[PDB]
Write a protein that binds this ligand. Sequence first.
Ligand SMILES: O=C(O)c1ccc[n+]([C@@H]2O[C@H](COP(=O)([O-])O)[C@@H](O)[C@H]2O)c1
Ligand SMILES: O=C(O)c1ccc[n+]([C@@H]2O[C@H](COP(=O)([O-])O)[C@@H](O)[C@H]2O)c1
Ligand SMILES: Cc1ccc(C)c(N)c1
Ligand SMILES: Cc1ccc(C)c(N)c1
Lengths: 347, 347
Amino acid sequence: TLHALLRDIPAPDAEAMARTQQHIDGLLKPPGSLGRLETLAVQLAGMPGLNGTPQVGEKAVLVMCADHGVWDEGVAVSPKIVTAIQAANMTRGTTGVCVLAAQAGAKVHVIDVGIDAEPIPGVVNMRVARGCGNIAVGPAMSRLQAEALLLEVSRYTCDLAQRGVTLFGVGELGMANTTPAAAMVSVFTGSDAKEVVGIGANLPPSRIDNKVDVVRRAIAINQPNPRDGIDVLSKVGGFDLVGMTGVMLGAARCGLPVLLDGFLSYSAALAACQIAPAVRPYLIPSHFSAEKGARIALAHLSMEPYLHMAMRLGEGSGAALAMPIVEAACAMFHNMGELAASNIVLP
Amino acid sequence: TLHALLRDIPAPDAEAMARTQQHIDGLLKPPGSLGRLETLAVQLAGMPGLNGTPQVGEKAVLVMCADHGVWDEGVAVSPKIVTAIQAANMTRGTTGVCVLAAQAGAKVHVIDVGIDAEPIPGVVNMRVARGCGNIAVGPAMSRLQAEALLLEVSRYTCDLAQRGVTLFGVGELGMANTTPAAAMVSVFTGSDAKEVVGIGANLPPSRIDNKVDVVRRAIAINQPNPRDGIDVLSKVGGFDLVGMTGVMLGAARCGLPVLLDGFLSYSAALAACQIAPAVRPYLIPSHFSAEKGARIALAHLSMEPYLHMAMRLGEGSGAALAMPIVEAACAMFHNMGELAASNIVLP
Ligand SMILES: O=C(O)c1ccc[n+]([C@@H]2O[C@H](COP(=O)([O-])O)[C@@H](O)[C@H]2O)c1
Ligand SMILES: O=C(O)c1ccc[n+]([C@@H]2O[C@H](COP(=O)([O-])O)[C@@H](O)[C@H]2O)c1
Ligand SMILES: Cc1ccc(C)c(N)c1
Ligand SMILES: Cc1ccc(C)c(N)c1
């Protein structure tokens, strides 16, 4: 089933991309003058789910919520209940992503993949358990739990495509999740924990040493295999991270674009690309996270964010903020006039 | 008159900014987690024309169009008539800024401050002459012509404020204008011409040496005084550059925000800040121009753009692209919920 999923991810349509480039070169402007906006429009044109042209229909931001057992290691200053409280606030439209998604005309889907609290009405229920295992002393979950969630979220994502959604944004919510995210980044990039462990949600500079030690213990004890993205996710990841990876696999299978968010999303994208390299062409960066390990993670994904906002909230807020940029590349493509029509000739 | 203008530019309102910061710190998120979006909202709150709160009413992009005599020195590959043709296309909504402004819900004002062609219907007429003087052999214009245009554009800009406009964007259109822009940057920053001369609108790499020589000749022959922003503008600038500087002085006098665009706008902002330092707090960067001298210009304005799009079209296209970011900071401020209301307490 998951093998079928991964097997059926479409390659980009080179024919549509060639037609796109030619059309862009003929627009009313010096060739290549709109830089990354042009490359973005061509990238979009190659995505099968977009019907050979850069376009944006409905937009959705999927927010994966879960708690982590590693919170008990004192790696986070936010009360663990904030996960459940914020998840509820998501249904009320008062959070950061809700406000930014509203601005971009996108709908937010709040998905509970493992919150340690009673079920929250209004939230999509896909909970694996009440929080994942404490990665400092063992695995976050079993391989089967990771594979099942990947499959479940993948299907949900591509099912939305059937309802008009053509652009996705990924996000998360889970106290302490920058710890497993750092563990995954260290494992995938081969970087020492000290280089990728950040302050997360305002962790005091005096408590960073403990966080670094926790990440190292998690790796030593679990011995995750860097060449097996699912092994890494299940051992030192979390339900929320798995869920984000699932959105990326689902959209790619659907041949549609996915906007990344911040540091947590970069770790999930590293896992997704390890599991299936064919997912890469569907990923679009949004902003450059203020988290310490962002530069290393982005270098390994070979991505250069469009927005430098020093943001570090998460929730998919950066993804929503970049949606207007994607629509701008589409507007450029479809609405600009052409050089030939104005009798303009440039060498 | 111009002395009155410069004298009456308001200082930022520290009281409104303090109230803004306190409100932002209390929003439903870890303090400072939205980074530059928070600093932007506070900056806006201090602008008197915004009534003590970050808000955006109507938006306008002012595009200054003019031709340059230095075009005859072979520093540009685009036919000189493109200025007049593109200015006309601006009235038809087919250009890059028109499409991006439409996306942001902004109106484009096309202003002819010196196009070397017959008047174009639909374009605001403020032409000083049919193109400015060739800066390679003398001044672009007289000091009085520069001062008069500054005053004229300044008044037009603040007059729009009376019609609901609260956010401005500046742009230009003029073949060969990256040459005087480079001259101004060299003069204001004390950088050698070779470090700030770029390829402009696809100038062949083999013709760059000539462009560098032209910039040096312009400076040697005119001897512009770096401490007199108006002296520099009139000697080695152009009508379009003067006009952009005028929008910045007008909006600041009006106590309203102005979004910069690319390299041409950075040179105009250096002039404006030299003429009146009080203008600085009203300037908002948009993107990081692909032009070679952008890094140096931005360092001297002490600005860090939000968008890295490798754009180099001009027209105010980058300014329009960043307008959604300004509205996002306002939406964050007014629409997010508060920590206290959810009983959340963070150290
Ligand atoms: O998206 C980022 O780059 C990001 C960077 C730092 C912190 N966060 C958010 O803060 C939480 C993780 O921080 P922490 O200290 O509990 O590990 C989680 O709920 C994220 O939404 C998010
Ligand atoms: O805005 C920029 O950063 C920008 C950078 C390079 C070129 N341009 C545009 O191209 C023109 C100047 O290029 P050039 O080669 O004629 O000096 C002018 O009409 C600008 O709108 C604009
Ligand atoms: C077509 C065309 C050519 C050159 C420039 C600078 C613009 N703005 C447009
Ligand atoms: C309030 C609050 C606290 C911590 C985080 C990570 C979010 N998203 C929100």
